[PDB]
Design a protein around this ligand. Structure first.
Ligand code: FMN
Length: 169
């Protein structure tokens, strides 16, 4: 497929989100679903468009699978690639580290030369701090299944519509 979606998940929430995003784009012919646990950093070179999904764990940390491959990301040339991000988090229980993982990954990947696409508004959330916020916007789609499960479907539909334009679809 033209778009490669790489996700990491601990309790399965991020995977379900990834599956809905794939479905919203039109299926396997449009988006390849890849678990980062089974991937090598170089697998990311094969796509011009990437979607990175990662839930925040422990104290504002990367999901373990993303944690593992983090240092290897330096070996991938991201120049010219357009990358979107999404993450699962808990704004109530971790109000000081909401969606930190997504922020940590975007900081690293954008520093390697990629173009971030898919900024999302912060107004629909209530949190104190997040490493995923830049100039009053999230760097990617923030999902909260713990506190706002009723908003997920529409958030995904809206975000995917937004990305289609930016990914040339
Ligand atoms: C031990 C623990 C630590 C967590 N830490 C954070 C955090 O620092 N920031 C955040 O936004 N969410 C945090 N969360 C919420 C999770 O990211 C959230 O439950 C998410 O749906 C987990 O996704 P997964 O099933 O894909 O791994 C934490 C949850 C648990 C159980």
């Amino acid at each position: 497929a033209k778009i490669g979606l790489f996700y990491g998940t601990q309790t399965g929430v991020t995977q379900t989100i990834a599956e809905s995003i794939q479905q919203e784009f039109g299926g396997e012919s449009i988006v390849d679903l890849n678990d980062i646990a089974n991937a090598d950093a170089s697998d990311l070179n094969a796509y011009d468009y990437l979607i990175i999904g990662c839930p925040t764990w422990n104290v504002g940390e990367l999901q373990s699978d993303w944690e593992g491959i983090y240092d290897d990301l330096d070996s991938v040339n991201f120049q010219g690639k357009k990358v979107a991000y999404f993450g699962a988090g808990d704004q109530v229980g971790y109000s000081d580290n909401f969606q930190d993982a997504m922020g940590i990954l975007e900081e690293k990947i954008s520093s390697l030369g990629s173009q971030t696409v898919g900024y999302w508004p912060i107004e629909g959330y209530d949190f104190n701090e997040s490493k995923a916020v830049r100039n009053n916007q999230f760097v990617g789609l923030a999902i909260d299944e713990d506190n706002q499960p009723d908003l997920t479907k529409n958030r995904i539909k809206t975000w995917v519509s937004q990305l289609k334009s930016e990914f040339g679809l």
